[PDB]
Amino acid sequence: EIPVIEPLFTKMTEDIPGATGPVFDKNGDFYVVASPLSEALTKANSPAEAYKASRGAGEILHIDLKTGKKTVICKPEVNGYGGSPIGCQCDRDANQLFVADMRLGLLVVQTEGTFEEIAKKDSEGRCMQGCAYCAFDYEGNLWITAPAGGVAPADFTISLREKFGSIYCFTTDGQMIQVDTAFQCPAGIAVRHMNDGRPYQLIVAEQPTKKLWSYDIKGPANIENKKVWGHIPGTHKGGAAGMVFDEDNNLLVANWGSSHIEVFGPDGGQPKMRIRCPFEKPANLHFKPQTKTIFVTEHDNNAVWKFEWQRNGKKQYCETSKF
């Protein structure tokens, strides 16, 4: 039996469809992503059906943590095609967000709301797929999951039932390298680092398959030894979505549809503990820097909550020093 804890959750905000991409920038400002397409995929009989019902482009919102006021930072669209941002990370050398988008690929978003679409195509020259989750390594290379088909203007599709989801690395030389493919809905992603700051394991959630995969990282866009690393419990619709490390390199994983966040030790395997949530659909999570406080987004109430974890979070790339 896996032991379960039931900490206190405090609701921070609501009325955010498909709430995801919780992120803190270098100033300690907190952002979340609204995703009409996420919410639609939850209710549809198909990706197409979901795409059709989706009210519009998603948005990056600033949330004031004292007042709860939501401010639209960016509503990305390119050429009439609405973006579907999901996952975010803050850069280290500039206060700007790198945003995985299921319709537009990888974005760089400024706090004043301008943005750049980073890649129409990958380095081999093939079209880009829609991106969902991303994680910086401490070198500045961005690892990205891509569960969707081609970016707009291709029809929207997602690898929820077929194997076509891919993994990329966007390197510090600005190359978008496809590093793996034929996933069934690759979702959350994380980089385990060595004591010395060196990147060395890539953890990737494959959502409906209730699996976490690992690879050994040997350099920028250079991975091998692909293995199943962790088991996600339950037979519910869903599976692992976002994930984050704590300071001890335990991996916390939102298990969408299970009402739990799963906690894996450094060697993976089975969860060592589960965290019971007051909602069925935790989607994504992020630590408040230099704190034990975890912010969690959820799709029962399209809300953001916080709870206290047993230790501080692992530093993100944005919190580390250039030298």
Curated annotation (Swiss-Prot):
EC annotation from Swiss-Prot or TrEMBL: 3.8.2.2
Effect of residue 286 to N: 85% decrease in activity
Activity-regulation annotation: Inhibited by chelating agents.
Catalytic activity field: diisopropyl fluorophosphate + H2O = diisopropyl phosphate + fluoride + 2 H(+)
InterPro entries, alphabetized: 6-blade_b-propeller_TolB-like, SGL, SMP-30/CGR1_Lactonase
UniProt GO MF annotations: calcium ion binding; diisopropyl-fluorophosphatase activity
Keywords of this entry: Calcium, Hydrolase, Metal-binding
Gene3D superfamilies: TolB, C-terminal domain
Assembly and oligomerization: Monomer.
Protein name (Swiss-Prot/TrEMBL): Diisopropyl-fluorophosphatase
Organism whose genome encodes this protein: Loligo vulgaris
